[PDB]
Symmetry: C14
């Protein structure tokens, strides 16, 4: 049990570096697709960011979901 | 059992960092495809976001579905 | 059995964070492809959403199918 | 047997959250490719949806095929 | 045998939720590529659908092939 | 043997839901690429289908090849 | 041996539903790329098909290669 | 040995349905990219095929390489 | 336990070099899509970077999340 | 040894049907990209092929490298 | 333990050559997308690099994160 | 040892049919991208090939690297 | 231990040929995207390379990171 | 040990035919993207190659890194 449930929480813990994969790709496109847009009409800048950030927010949200459960299995393990 | 059903809930728990993958890619496109659109016609801004957010909502919905069952297996385990 | 059928339902349970993958990618495109469309002709807005949402509905449907069977194996397990 | 055939139906059960993958991606494109089309010629709206939905129907069909066999192995198991 | 051949049919059973993958992606493009086409020339509508459906038919065909063998291994198992 | 060669034919059986993958993607493109073509020049319709179907035929062919060997291992097993 | 070489031929048998993958994708593009071409210049039709079919032939060829060795391991097993 | 080297040749045999994958995708593009080309300038037809076939030849070549070694391990096994 | 929970934390530790994957791809696009944009209108430079960096920030954020839990399992292990 | 080194050479033998993958995709593009080029300027034909073939040569080269070592492990095994 | 926790740190160690994957792809695009941009307006050069490098910095950052934990598990192992 | 180190060299040997994958895709593009270029300006032919071949050279180089170590492990095994 | 920690360092050692993957793809695009750019405006050459090389530098950097830890585990093993 | 550390170096040895993958794809694009560029402006030839080769150099570099450690584990094994 402390042999397994220990080592387990560990293995299973870090198998929440998948929370990087999905978003990592995503948000990075949003950023990319915004930075060019701004390049075109720079007086529209901000009107861009406001969403980028808005979006960029909860790309990063569902990675922390893991980082939460990553540490909640590690240092909050039951 | 506490050897297995423990370690199990753990492993199986974090194998809900797949909830990051799908959406992570998606919403990030929506954001991207909106930020450029706004770049083009900035008086159409909002008329954009209203959907982005609408959409951006339930991209993030079906990642929490896991985060729910992630923790429901962890701290609500039966 | 409670060793296996337990740990089993668990592992098998969270292997319904695949319900995130497919849709996650999809709907997010729909959203994306709509938000730009609206950017172009904003008086056509809504005439867009009406479908986005329509669609956006049952992208999210077949992820819950799992979330259903995710919890139905977990807290309804037979 | 109840050790195996049990845990089995379970594992095998949730490995029908693949029914999300394929369609999830698909229908979501259909939606996407329709919402833009409508953006262009909004008096052609409906003439679009009629198919979207038509299609959107049996994307969702072959996901339930699993959800059927997902629950038919679970609560109808032989 | 009933230990194996049972659990077997089960595992092997649900590993016909791959019948979702291929088609899921496909038909959904057909749909998508038709809905836009109709957007362009709406008096050509139908002349489109007639094939969509035609095609849309036997995308869904080779998913049921599995659903058939899915249940044929399950409730018709030899 | 009936432990193995049984369970075997089963596992191996359903691992012919790969016959869905390849084609599923393909034909669905053919359909898609035809439906648009017809959208453009509708008096060329049929001159399209004649091939679509021609093609659409033996996309579906090499999926049944499996469905054949799917059931030939199952109910014709040697 | 009949335990193994049996079950073996079976497993190894159906692992020739990969013959679907490669071609499945391919030919379906050929079909697709022809059907559009014909859409453009319909008096060039046939001059198209003649190759499509020509090609479409031995896409389907190297899938049967397996179906051959699929059944040759099954009902011709040595 | 006849337990292993037998079952072996079998497994290893059918793991030459990978010869389908690569080519299956390829040739099918060649075909596709030729059929459209001919669509454009039909008096250049043949001047196309001559290569298609030329190419189409030894796409199919390196699939048989396997089919050769597929059967050479099966019915020529040492 | 120190056999398992040790080796475990190790394996599981480095399986947080997935934190590189997602972002690695992403941010690198943002950068890319900005650098071109700037190429076009260089007096809009900065108005670009301000976001790039903004974004580029928390692409790198959800990789350190791991690097944190990478070292927190390693040198903070419980 | 003849149990292992036999079955081994076999398994390892056919795991040189990967020589199909890489090239299979490649050359098939070269062919494809040439056939269209010729479509455009047919008096440049040959001036194309000369390279196609040149290339098409040693795409097929590094597949046989395997076929060589495929049979060199099989019928030349040490 | 020194059997496991040793070998472990090793295996787990080099499974931080994934830190190459993500970035490897990324930064290389940024570079690529900048080099072309500069090709277009060479008096905007530098105004490009300043970001390239900026970005190119912390693509390489989150690969070293591993190289750090790569060696920190190796020669700093606890 | 001769049980293992034998079978090993074998397995490990043929797992250098990956030397096909990478290049296989690559060079084939070079070829493809040259053959079209030549199609456009045929008096520039050769000025093309000179590089194609140059390149085409050491795509094929790093596949033989394996073929070298493929046979060096096989018939030069230590 | 010398059984494991040896073989380990070996296996784990060569699983730092992933340092090839990421970059391999990348830098090669940078190169590609620069070589074309120079094709367009050749008096801007160098102004290109200066970055290519700059970039091309630390694509190759994070592959050696491994080659370092590749040999550091091999001939510097602790 | 000579059972393991032997067979190990072998297996691990050839798992440095991944050094083919990354680059194989890459350089081949550089080549491709240069050969076309030269097609366009042939008096800019060389000004191209100089970089191609420059680049083409150290695509091939980080494949030999393996070939080095490929043989360094094989015939320099410690």
């Amino acid at each position: 049990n402390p042999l397994i449930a220990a080592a387990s929480v560990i293995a299973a813990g870090l198998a929440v570096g998948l929370a990087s994969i999905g978003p990592g790709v995503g948000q990075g496109t949003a950023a990319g697709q915004a930075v060019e847009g701004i390049a075109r009409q720079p007086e529209a800048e901000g009107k861009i960011r406001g969403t980028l950030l808005l979006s960029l927010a909860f790309m990063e949200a569902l990675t922390i979901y893991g980082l939460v459960v990553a540490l909640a299995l590690l240092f909050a393990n039951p």
